[PDB]
Design a protein around this nucleic acid. Structure first.
Ligand SMILES: [Zn+2]
Ligand SMILES: [Zn+2]
Lengths: 148, 76, 99, 109, 83, 85, 93, 99, 82, 94, 108
DNA sequence: ATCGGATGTATATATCTGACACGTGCCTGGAGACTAGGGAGTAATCCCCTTGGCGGTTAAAACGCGGGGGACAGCGCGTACGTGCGTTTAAGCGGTGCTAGAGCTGTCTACGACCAATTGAGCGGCCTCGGCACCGGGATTCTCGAT
DNA sequence: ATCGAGAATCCCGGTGCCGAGGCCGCTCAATTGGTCGTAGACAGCTCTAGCACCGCTTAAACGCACGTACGCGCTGTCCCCCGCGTTTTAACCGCCAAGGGGATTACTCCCTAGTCTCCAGGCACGTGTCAGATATATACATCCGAT
């Protein structure tokens, strides 16, 4: 199919130019299914924690975004308990020129600085807004108890 | 069979191994060549976590593959 | 020797006759064929009730009669007696049908 | 009224009141329908109907007939002034038009 | 089963009769083409809405009620055909 | 002057571009990509991300979407791409 | 079979009330049905809109009165308003 | 001896200037007095919101501009360049406002 | 009492309106006809506006009534609410 | 205080920012846009109501809205609006 | 779409879906209102508003202004082929008229 | 200003036929009685805004005059269109055959209405600074009388 | 074909002000959850009429010839709007002041939807008969060439 060649280009680009702190690939024989791992940036309270997530590619691609969901738990206002994520690139402003590598870089930038505009989990959002230290050590506790 | 692995510090190190090597053998070689304790090392290939029980050939690994290393610091 | 009316009188007789009757002035079969052709252009494989064709014919004839009356008024405004395509164009422009 | 006869007869009208009431209620015009509205509406409908019917009957009697045909209705509507304004944009099937010719078109004397 | 140039079925005497009904004495030699174009435009503008109405209701046959509804929506009410 | 084969490929398909369409931002795309991104995407240029709905409606009515010069150059100097499909 | 509803016998009664001698053909009768439906729909729609105008929720008599006053031209409006007021006054007792 | 423009060449200047701006072309108080007069004719002792007066003025302005544009179109069609009342009656006749 | 106010629409106002409409040369009998047709339009709109005000048991014809009368007549107006 | 009044001002401003990143808009234009939105919505809803009554139904389904859009608007605007509505409802369902 | 987010964002729109639903339900249009109707209606409304606003902004930029005024709205509406057809009988307050002088009237 | 043909139109009489006015079975919507509660009528209060008035200043309206361009009537030309006749064409009417699709009925399941707790989106009010209005000076460009 | 003087229009720079955009507090309608009566989606059946074809008239369409009257260009006359200058008038702006009625709230009560039962008014179908359409034969109004 037409999307198959574009995915071939994506996988070739990922192989020849692996990203830094993110690594992704097909867990199974089926090419549409995908999975990824992201390591927290150095300038973040997520040191030593790895986040694993799964992606489902629609049969009609690249004009429609794929479904991305974490399998691991973490303390973050945009990250839901079940792994639900809210980002404008993901659903609002998805474009054909966008690449999976680009959205992974956007996710890494989100990890660098949480988005306080429309967080998915707002209680921890106002907890973070109350003071930085509370969010810091609760994130450290979460990433050392489950993500590690 | 030469491969490359990059760590969190941005340095790439060279590993001369064979596809039949166990993951525990790989971690032992990494510890020997770096001094890092094995318990602080986590190995990821294309998002797939590596377990010491299995081997390299179980992931369909070809030549000059680039890997990622994660430091599991015991304490934070 | 043959007797022929002055040019224009039998036209007035026709005007007086046709404003007295109420039948339809377009042959039914060609109009039905035209309607079916337009419909098949829009959506293929359609069927028409007879009453729908009759209603379309009545609407078209009423609209054309009104347009011709207004066109004649516009042409008479220009100190003329005939009707010309620019008269039709102006009568349609003023009504806002084409603009 | 007597509160004993049929509603249309009680109101002293001829057009229906129950049917108009149902049409107002079920027609999705408002959540509630007052108790006096259908009487008013039926009266207005009957008055307009009687007006048009009387003009049509006079026009038919003029042409020496005993039945109002569409041409008679068309003549009755156009000849009158107010009814022409009320039905300005309507088209009557098998109607025809009023007989008129512009003064310029008539032959020179 | 296509159809070709059926607008030629609108004969010159028919348009002449229509003009006479409208109250026209003298007709030029170019009115016929313009009238044919106008008639085409009117039929397209009405048939579009008629077909839309008869398609929304999951029917394959246009009915006189559809035509009168399309005319009433367009702004030329027609009496004598129901509705 | 003549564009090379490497730059002649579609900016999205990663393959040869057929029936070029030029946008106000001077972006060239093939008709499949353009039509599909009109009818199931955000309806904007994927490269610059600005609305082109007005231009698209204007140029669809009179069939002014295609650019003749680039299409004819590609067809004449690169014909067997068209022979492929 | 499914029956159709129309104002036929009512219009016929009105005609016999006005002109006792004349009859009415079928096509003109359908024309009159359509006209009655048209006037009813116009008046009721205007009344419903005007009722929604003033943040009300019910269509009372004066609503129809104002709708009739708005739609019909002068003399017809006055005569119809008088007729309706007389009818409702006769009905209320 | 003083500079005088050819007759008509300044009317085009007024047309160009007045088709570019959007200010109101009729003074406020006379229009308000006329509106109050007519309303007092219909119902006595009525008060008017200023916004209502402005809206009425806007509607009248648009209607008059449109009518004059149609009248000028008719005058051009009549092989002339001036508007006379019969042009206005013809324009209002074709639009169906009087009949 | 108010009387003889239709002359408030002075000749320069009508000339300006025609100039906006695209009129080059104006005759001498245009002004009276324009005043008459304007009076017709004002009467026809004000009747509906005042009727709408009457129905609401009110005493001031607010701009909403004028807007809605214009909408009823088929001359929809924007910018004043609605 | 005055009773709360409803308007489309904020949504129009959001759309304007989405289209033109650096363009302001006066209050009169806000009033005009709000009236335009109200007028178009009323036209479409009334057409859909009449159409759904004409088939002896009782529910205004998205098909009625689609047919009303196909009726009121001219050709090209109708096609674009139908495409946009279909895309929106398809995204909303899943 | 995934739940736990506002209805307007589920379909990617910006116009208020819930408000349109309430207006449809309480506006005396039909006895029952489907659950897919408000989304479609909001989509159409938002598309039309965006389409008119694009042209208005383009005209305002052409007039060296950064604030849209009703004159720009009229210039955008009347210069478009389809929008003029749709808004045939609508008078924009303080909108003026298009610049148009007949060909015959120009000096020779 | 007629006068005689010659034409078309109007008018009086037989007839026969199909559509209208009426009679009848019946069943589905309309009428009657009773209940609940919310929508609307009514009284009271507040304060916004509409009406009213005065003074200035000045841009806009009113009036007059010279004239040049445009409206309008008259003449001549020839070409396009009205009018009549013979010929060709397909519309109109009847009769028959076939079936695709309109219309009606029975099942039942999923879509939408209703109600309660709740909370965040959206509105009213304040404030501020920049985009637009305004003024003065100068550069640019149609315009017309004169060659 | 042109050159130039006078006049209107566009650019540019500086100054100022008020309204549009952002922020805060808040209250109420959208949200989510759960339950339940029913609208219509589907399968099935019946049977109406829409389509297709064939044959026979004959009425309408077509092509052609001839003449004439009407459209159009051209000329001439005259008169009436236009452009400009001067004088009068009232529109507009800012100011103040008063109270009328629009807008809101609290209270109460009675009008109408909803339910059940029962029954007769209108609808479908069938039938008789005369109003009007048709054919035929006279009577009269009207037109056109010619005195
Ligand atoms: Zn492509
Ligand atoms: Zn672009």
């Amino acid at each position: 199919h037409m999307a198959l060649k574009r995915i071939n280009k994506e996988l070739s680009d990922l192989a020849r130019d692996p990203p830094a702190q993110i690594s992704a690939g097909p867990v199974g024989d089926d090419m549409f299914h995908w999975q990824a791992t992201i390591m927290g940036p150095n300038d973040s309270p997520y040191q030593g924690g790895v986040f694993f997530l799964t992606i489902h590619f629609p049969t009609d691609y690249p004009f429609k975004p794929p479904k991305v969901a974490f399998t691991t738990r973490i303390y973050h206002p945009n990250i839901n308990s079940n792994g639900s994520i809210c980002l404008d690139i993901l659903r609002s402003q998805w474009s054909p020129a966008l690449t999976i590598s680009k959205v992974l870089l956007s996710i890494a930038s989100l990890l660098d600085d949480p988005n306080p505009d429309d967080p998915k989990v707002p209680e921890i959002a106002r907890i973070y807004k109350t003071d930085r230290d509370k969010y810091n050590r609760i994130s450290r506790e979460w990433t050392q108890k489950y993500a590690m | 069979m030469q491969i490359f692995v990059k760590t969190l510090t941005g340095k790439t190190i060279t590993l001369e191994v064979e596809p039949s090597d166990t993951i525990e053998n790989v971690k032992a070689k990494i510890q020997d060549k770096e001094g890092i304790p094995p318990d602080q090392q986590r190995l990821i290939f294309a998002g797939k976590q590596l377990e010491d029980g299995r081997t390299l050939s179980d992931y369909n690994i070809q030549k000059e593959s680039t890997l990622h290393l994660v430091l599991r610091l015991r304490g934070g | 020797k043959p007797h022929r009316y002055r040019p224009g009188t039998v036209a007035l007789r026709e005007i007086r006759r046709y404003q007295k009757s109420t039948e339809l002035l377009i042959r039914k079969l060609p109009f039905q064929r035209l309607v079916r052709e337009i419909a098949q252009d829009f959506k293929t494989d359609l069927r028409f009730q007879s009453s729908a064709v009759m209603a379309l014919q009545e609407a078209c004839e009423a609209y054309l009669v009104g347009l011709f009356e207004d066109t004649n008024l516009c042409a008479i405004h220009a100190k003329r007696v005939t009707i010309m395509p620019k008269d039709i164009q102006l009568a349609r422009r003023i009504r806002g049908e084409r603009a | 009224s007597a509160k004993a006869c049929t509603r249309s007869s009680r109101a002293g009208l001829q057009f229906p009141v129950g049917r108009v009431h149902r049409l107002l209620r079920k027609g999705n015009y408002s959540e509630r329908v007052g108790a006096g509205a259908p009487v008013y509406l039926a009266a207005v409908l009957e008055y307009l109907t009687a007006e048009i019917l009387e003009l049509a009957g006079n026009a038919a009697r003029d042409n020496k007939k005993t039945r109002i045909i569409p041409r008679h209705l068309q003549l009755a509507i156009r000849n009158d002034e107010e009814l022409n304004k009320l039905l300005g944009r309507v088209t009557i099937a098998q109607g025809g038009v009023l007989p008129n010719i512009q003064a310029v078109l008539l032959p020179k004397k | 089963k296509v159809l070709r140039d059926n607008i030629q079925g609108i004969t010159k005497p028919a348009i002449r009769r229509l003009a006479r009904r409208g109250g026209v004495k003298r007709i030029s030699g170019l009115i016929y083409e313009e009238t044919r174009g106008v008639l085409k435009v009117f039929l397209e503008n009405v048939i579009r809405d008629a077909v839309t109405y008869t398609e929304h209701a999951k029917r394959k046959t246009v009915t006189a009620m559809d035509v009168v509804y399309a005319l009433k929506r367009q702004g030329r009410t027609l009496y004598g055909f129901g509705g | 002057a003549i564009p090379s084969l490497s730059e002649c490929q579609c900016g999205i398909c990663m393959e040869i571009l057929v029936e070029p369409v030029t946008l106000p931002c001077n972006h060239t795309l093939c008709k499949p990509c353009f039509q599909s991104t009109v009818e199931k995407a955000s309806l904007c240029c994927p490269f610059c991300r600005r609305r082109v709905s007005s231009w698209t409606r204007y140029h669809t009515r009179r069939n002014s979407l295609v650019n003749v010069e680039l299409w004819t150059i590609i067809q004449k100097h690169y014909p067997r791409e068209c022979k492929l499909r | 079979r499914s029956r159709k509803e129309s104002y036929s016998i009512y219009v016929y009664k009105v005609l016999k009330q006005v002109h006792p001698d004349t009859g009415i053909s079928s096509k003109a009768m359908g024309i009159m049905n359509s006209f009655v439906n048209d006037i009813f729909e116009r008046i009721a729609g205007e009344a419903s809109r005007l009722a929604h105008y003033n943040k009300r929720s019910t269509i009372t008599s004066r609503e129809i009165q104002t709708a009739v006053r708005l739609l019909l031209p002068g003399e017809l409006a006055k005569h119809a308003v008088s007729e309706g007021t007389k009818a409702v006054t006769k009905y209320t007792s």
